[PDB]
Amino acid sequence: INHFEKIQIIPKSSWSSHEASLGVSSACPYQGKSSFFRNVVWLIKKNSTYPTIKRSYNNTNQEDLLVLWGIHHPKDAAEQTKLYQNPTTYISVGTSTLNQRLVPRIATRSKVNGQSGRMEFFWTILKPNDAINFESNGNFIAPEYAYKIVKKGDSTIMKSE
Amino acid sequence: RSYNNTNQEDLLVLWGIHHPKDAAEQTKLYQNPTTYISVGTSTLNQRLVPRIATRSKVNGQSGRMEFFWTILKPNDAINFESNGNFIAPEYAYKIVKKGDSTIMKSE
Numbered sequence: 001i002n003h004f005e006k007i008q009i010i011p012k013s014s015w016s017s018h019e020a021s022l023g024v025s026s027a028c029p030y031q032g033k034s035s036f037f038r039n040v041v042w043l044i045k046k047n048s049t050y051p052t053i054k055r056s057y058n059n060t061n062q063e064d065l066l067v068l069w070g071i072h073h074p075k076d077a078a079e080q081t082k083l084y085q086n087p088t089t090y091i092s093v094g095t096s097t098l099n100q101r102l103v104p105r106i107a108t109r110s111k112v113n114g115q116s117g118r119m120e121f122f123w124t125i126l127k128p129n130d131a132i133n134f135e136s137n138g139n140f141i142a143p144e145y146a147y148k149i150v151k152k153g154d155s156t157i158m159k160s161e
Numbered sequence: 162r163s164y165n166n167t168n169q170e171d172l173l174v175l176w177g178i179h180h181p182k183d184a185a186e187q188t189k190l191y192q193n194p195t196t197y198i199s200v201g202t203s204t205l206n207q208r209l210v211p212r213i214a215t216r217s218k219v220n221g222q223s224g225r226m227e228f229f230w231t232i233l234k235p236n237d238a239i240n241f242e243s244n245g246n247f248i249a250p251e252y253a254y255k256i257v258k259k260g261d262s263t264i265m266k267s268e
């Protein structure tokens with residue numbers, strides 16, 4: 001791959017049933033304030049409720065699309081209900097080929113960047129005319145931006161200081 | 162169900178699991194909302210669970226079939242247990258002749 005074209009597939013504003021603007025951490029600082037990975041949305045409960053999410057995006061572009069998403073693994077049972085209410089959650093992802101179902105694993109973990117929680121990130125290539133389908137109870141790190149693959153050719157990742 | 166390989170030959174056994182479209186279809190086909198398939202042999206120790214999700218329609222199906230296999234050696238037994246979503250074997254293949262071969266890609 002020689003060129004990506006970033007596009008928005010699921011707007012940040014369109015999460016009218018969940019809190020999409022409080023998904024930040026001191027582990028990801030920006031100009032002295034708590035921030036987060038800009039291309040994905042850390043969704044949490046709104047007014048003490050996390051209703052089931054059911055979102056679909058259809059690849060209407062000519063280009064193959066690289067889609068990124070994630071799952072949050074919390075520190076303990078208290079933090080789970082604190083962020084998402086529901087004690088047992090999941091994320092199910094489907095495409096033409098893909099048939100995924102993720103569940104958050106809870107455990108006591110060492111503090112990296114002052115966090116005992118973890119983020120596990122996943123990806124897929126959504127081919128043209130195919131649709132990706134999400135469903136979740138919580139712990140969902142939703143895509144906002146995905147990358148179009150516009151130019152394919154000779155390239156390499158070169159390790160150098 | 163249990164099958165005992167009484168043949169002299171190694172046996173190729175095939176089975177599967179059905180992944181349904183939604184919770185309604187699960188109870189519609191199999192009643193039980195939470196199911197599994199457990200498979201055991203001399204070596205094998207498997208337990209499959211159906212994963213549910215909204216999926217694109219390939220050949221007009223939102224459901225999926227995931228297929229599995231094993232080689233059941235002579236004098237060994239294969240054991241199945243399931244609540245639903247089980248795609249059970251009917252026929253399996255005896256391996257009678259082993260030798261030089263290849264799968265050749267050609268139109």
Ligand SMILES: *[C@@H]1O[C@H](CO)[C@@H](O[C@@H]2O[C@H](CO)[C@@H](O)[C@H](O)[C@H]2NC(C)=O)[C@H](O)[C@H]1NC(C)=O
Nearest residue numbers: 163164165166167168169203235236237238239
């Ligand atoms: C069926 O599987 C059993 C074990 O799950 C196999 O064990 C044979 O069983 C008898 C015991 O009644 C032994 O005397 C034999 O030595 C075993 N046979 C061989 C050839 O190893 C059982 O053999 C299998 N059934 C058969 C061969 O009919």
Ligand SMILES: *[C@@H]1O[C@H](CO)[C@@H](O)[C@H](O)[C@H]1NC(C)=O
Nearest residue numbers: 058059060129130131217218
């Ligand atoms: C959306 O995807 C479907 C199949 O998943 C496809 O048939 C359809 O043409 C796409 N939508 C368009 C072109 O508006």
